[PDB]
Design a protein around this ligand. Structure first.
Ligand SMILES: *[C@@H]1O[C@H](CO)[C@@H](O[C@@H]2O[C@H](CO)[C@@H](O)[C@H](O)[C@H]2NC(C)=O)[C@H](O)[C@H]1NC(C)=O
Ligand SMILES: *[C@@H]1O[C@H](CO)[C@@H](O[C@@H]2O[C@H](CO)[C@@H](O)[C@H](O)[C@H]2NC(C)=O)[C@H](O)[C@H]1NC(C)=O
Ligand code: NAG
Ligand code: 3HB
Ligand code: FE
Ligand code: ZN
Ligand code: ZN
Length: 341
């Protein structure tokens, strides 16, 4: 044991971390940086201990040595009262969502349309959908498939950042942090909701969480599921209730990673921290909840019930799985063994 420094990405997660910190009685402190790549860097340097990460990033971090420590576990499909902490994660569904009113749109007609991505390098928002698109077009010219996009983390002056909108003031356009309006699971679905884009690449959960009044935000409060459809790989369209059969891939749950050397200390600190701030936690809701950020998904997706332990003390390849790791490698051949820092 000792204090655990957490790395927050953006001023919003910075604000949330500071609060956790205050409430942990400086048991956990905070370090902020502008992007997840920067936070991976602070950790290698040793100035931060840990952060929660989407699989695509787990891949960046893993090549550099950081290991998965505990994974996100969302409300279980079935009646498993065998603990959340010990219950094996499920993997979330990666889907492609469109407006039902955009009638002729299918997977086979996405060329030249407008797209919304969570962020470059993420599983559902990028790696899954673009990996498939390169594969099918036998061409790495993926910066030219759609006519415009909001893919946070791309070049602000390129096609890919053309639909992004930055912050309140119109600044920080296309930055891969919550300051960019259309970044993340919620930011990319808002991009589609507002009709800035024709298609959004998010997880199944996102569609459900920002519709039928589950979100009281202004852009989403009037959104209904029937007004959306999913794009399957066979070319048909399906309601948002048929995710099970109409998804692009199943995705490894986001997971907390730290440097191998500090992984055990972080593991112990987090299990104790979720005991006071997790779901059914001691100080949640009363004082502070780690898994709540008014649907903004700050430091942890809002639908997390707990951070589970990983059975098999897996490496980042075993945790990300063999299927996915070769998908990310080939896709990345368009721009197989190196830590880029
Ligand atoms: C798609 O996402 C939603 C959101 O997480 C899932 O529905 C929740 O599912 C749990 C059980 O799996 C239920 O107890 C909740 O009542 C559901 N909430 C809503 C809004 O329905 C749904 O299970 C997911 N479906 C797939 C394909 O995984
Ligand atoms: C895109 O295609 C490549 C090549 O088909 C896939 O990589 C192959 O995947 C198979 C089984 O998944 C492996 O046995 C081979 O080792 C892979 N080939 C190579 C060159 O590594 C990749 O999985 C595909 N991407 C997506 C997103 O489906
Ligand atoms: C912080 O950690 C110390 C050492 O484990 C523990 O005794 C204490 O309960 C923790 N305090 C808070 C607020 O989490
Ligand atoms: O393939 C998955 O089912 C899966 C889902 C979650 C975590 C994980 O390592 C794997
Ligand atoms: Fe993700
Ligand atoms: Zn499947
Ligand atoms: Zn192993």
């Amino acid at each position: 044991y000792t204090r655990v420094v957490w790395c927050a990405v953006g001023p919003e997660e910075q604000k949330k971390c500071q609060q956790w910190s205050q409430q942990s009685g400086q048991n956990v402190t905070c370090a902020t940086a502008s992007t997840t790549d920067d936070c991976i860097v602070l950790v290698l340097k040793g100035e931060a201990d840990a952060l929660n990460l989407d699989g695509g990033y787990i891949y960046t971090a893993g090549k550099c040595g950081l290991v998965p420590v505990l994974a996100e576990n969302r409300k279980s499909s079935k009646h498993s009262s065998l603990d959340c902490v010990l219950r094996p994660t499920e993997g979330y569904l990666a889907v492609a969502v469109v407006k039902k009113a955009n009638e002729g749109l299918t997977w086979n007609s996405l060329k030249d349309k407008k797209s919304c991505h969570t962020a470059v390098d993420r599983t559902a928002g990028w790696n899954i959908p673009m990996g498939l698109i390169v594969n099918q077009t036998g061409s790495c010219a993926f910066d030219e498939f759609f006519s415009q996009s909001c893919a946070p983390g791309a070049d602000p002056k390129s096609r890919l950042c053309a639909l992004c909108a930055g912050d309140d003031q119109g600044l920080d356009k296309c930055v891969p942090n919550s300051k960019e309006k259309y970044y993340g699971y919620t930011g990319a679905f808002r991009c589609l909701a507002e009709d800035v884009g024709d298609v959004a690449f998010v997880k199944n959960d996102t569609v459900w969480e920002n519709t039928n009044g589950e979100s009281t935000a202004d852009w989403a409060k009037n959104l209904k599921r029937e007004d959306f459809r999913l794009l399957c790989l066979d070319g048909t369209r399906k309601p948002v209730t048929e995710a099970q059969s109409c998804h692009l891939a199943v995705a490894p749950n986001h997971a907390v990673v730290s440097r191998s050397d500090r992984a055990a200390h972080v593991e112990q600190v987090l299990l104790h921290q979720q005991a006071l701030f997790g779901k059914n936690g001691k100080n949640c809701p009363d004082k502070f909840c780690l898994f709540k950020s008014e649907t903004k998904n700050l430091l942890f997706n809002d639908n997390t019930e707990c951070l589970a332990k990983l059975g098999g003390r897996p490496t980042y390849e075993e945790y990300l799985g063999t299927e996915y790791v070769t998908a990310i490698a080939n896709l990345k051949k368009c721009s197989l063994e190196a830590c880029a820092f």
